[PDB]
Amino acid sequence: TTGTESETKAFMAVCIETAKRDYRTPVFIFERLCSIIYPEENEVTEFFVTLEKDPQQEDFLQGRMPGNPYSSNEPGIGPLMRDIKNKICQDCDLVALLEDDSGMELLVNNKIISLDLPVAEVYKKVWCTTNEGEPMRIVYRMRGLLGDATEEFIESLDSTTDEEEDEEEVYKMAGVMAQCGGLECMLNRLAGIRDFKQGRHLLTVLLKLFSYCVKVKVNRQQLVKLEMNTLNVMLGTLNLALVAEQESKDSGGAAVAEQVLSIMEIILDESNALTGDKDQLVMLLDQINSTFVRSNPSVLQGLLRIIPYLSKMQILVERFKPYCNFDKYDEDHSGDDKVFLDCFCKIAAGIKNNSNGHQLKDLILQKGITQNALDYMKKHIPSAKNLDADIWKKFLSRPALPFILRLLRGLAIQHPGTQVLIGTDSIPNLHKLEQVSSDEGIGTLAENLLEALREH
C-alpha cells in the first residue's frame, strides 16, 4: 500500500472494481483512502510520565507520588493536565488545592503548562521535541510560594498564529483522486447500502471520505455534475439514516444524517458559486416535524440550511400557513408555533430566484399569507407622531411583529407581486416603523423590508 498517491489511487480503482465484483469488504479500502488524503496523526498509544515535586517546595508539599513512572493509560493520568493535578492532590492528601485550579502549577521542560491542555499533546509537542522516548517529567509546585513565576506559560499547544490551513491543499490528494473517478463509485456504494444496520460502518467511512473530498474544488465541481446524480444518492442516504434513528434511537442514524446534510449544503454552495424534484423537499418537511428530528437540533439546523437550495409547494403552504396566525400568536403561541414561524420566514428569505421559486412565492401570495400579515400590521400600528409613545412601545413589543416583518421581506425579495401588494398603503407604515429603533429591531427589519421593496 505504501507508495505514491497516483499508485494509491490506482490501487483504490482496483478496490472499487473488487467491491463491484456486502458492506464490510470495501470498508478497509476507504479507510486507507482517508488515511492517504488526511493522515490522522498517530495517537501516542502509550507513554509514561513522572510526577515529581519542585525540589524548592519539598518541605511545603505533603506526601510523594509513589507510582513513578505512571502509564498514560493509568486512571487519573489525563486526558487533561488538570486530571494529573487532581490525581496529585488526591494521592498526596492536598485537599485544599483540589478545588483551587490556581493553587498548583505543573511544569514540563521548565515551562508552566495550562491545566486545560491534553496530556498526550503536551507529551508530543513539548516533551518529545527534546526527550523523545523518555518518560515525560512533570514537576508540580504551589503557585506564588517562592514569588512570581518567571517561566514561560504555555496556554495553548497549538500555534498562537491563527493562520488557517488550506483545506484545498490539505486534502489535495482528494482533488487529484477525482482523476481515478472514485467519487462516482463512492456515490454508488452510498446507494448500494440498503441495510443501515449492516452498512453503518461502510456508510460512516464513505461519509468521512466524502467530507475530505468536498474540501477540494475539483471534487466539488465534479459532484455538481447532474451525471453523478449526487443529490438523489445523498437524499436517499439521509432518509435511510433518519428512518434508522426513528426505528432505533442511538443507532448512529442522527450523526450520519447530519453528515449527509453538511455535505449536501457544501455541494449546493459550490454549485451556486444540484436541483432535484420537489418531492425531496416534502420528505425533508415531514422529517423536520418527526419527533426525532425535532429533538435533534443539529439535524434540524442542517435540514433547515439545505431546504432553501432544494427550492409539494401546496404541502409546504398547508404545513406553515397555520402558524401565520399573527393575531393569535400575540394572544398565545407554543414553542413550535414560534419555531415553525421562524422556519417559514427563513424559507421565504432563501426561496431560490427561478421559475419554480417565483411560482412558490406567487402561491404563498395567493394564500393571503402576505395579505394577512399586511392586515394585522394595519389593525395594530399606532398613528401617534411620537414613535416612543407607550402605545408605540406596546405595539413594537408584539411577538408576531418581528416574524411578520422577516416573512414579508423574504417574500418581497425578487418577487414583484408581493412588492406591489405591500407597496400599496403599507410603505408609510413601514417607513414609520423603520424610524422606531426597538429591542426587537422592528426599525431595522422595516428598513430592510423597504430596501427589498426598492427592487420594484
Swiss-Prot record:
It is found in: Cytoplasm; Cytoplasm, Cytoskeleton; Nucleus. Disulfide bonds: none annotated. Belongs to the UBR4 family. E3 ubiquitin-protein ligase involved in different protein quality control pathways in the cytoplasm. Component of the N-end rule pathway: ubiquitinates proteins bearing specific N-terminal residues that are destabilizing according to the N-end rule, leading to their degradation. Recognizes both type-1 and type-2 N-degrons, containing positively charged amino acids (Arg, Lys and His) and bulky and hydrophobic amino acids, respectively. Does not ubiquitinate proteins that are acetylated at the N-terminus. It is linked to Episodic ataxia 8: A form of episodic ataxia, a neurologic disorder characterized by episodes of poor coordination and balance. EA8 affected individuals have attacks of unsteadiness, general weakness, and slurred speech. Additional variable features include twitching around the eyes, nystagmus, myokymia, and persistent intention tremor. Inheritance is autosomal dominant. The UBR-type zinc finger forms a pocket that mediates recognition of type 1 N-degrons. In addition to substrate-binding, the UBR-type zinc finger probably positions substrate proteins in the proximity of the bound and activated E2-ubiquitin conjugate to enable their ubiquitination. Constitutes an atypical E3 ubiquitin-protein ligase composed of a hemiRING-type zinc finger, a UBR-type zinc-finger interacting subdomain (UZI) and an N-terminal region that can serve as an affinity factor for the E2 conjugating enzymes UBE2A and UBE2B. Compared to classical RING-type, the hemiRING-type only binds a single zinc ion: a hydrogen bonding network is present instead of a second zinc ion. Component of the SIFI complex, composed of KCMF1, UBR4 and calmodulin (CALM1, CALM2 or CALM3). Interacts with E2 conjugating enzymes UBE2A and UBE2B. Interacts with RB1. (Microbial infection) Interacts with protein E7 from papilloma virus HPV-16, HPV-6B and HPV-11. This is E3 ubiquitin-protein ligase UBR4. It comes from Homo sapiens (Human). The chain holds residues 4299 to 4774 of 5183 of the full protein.
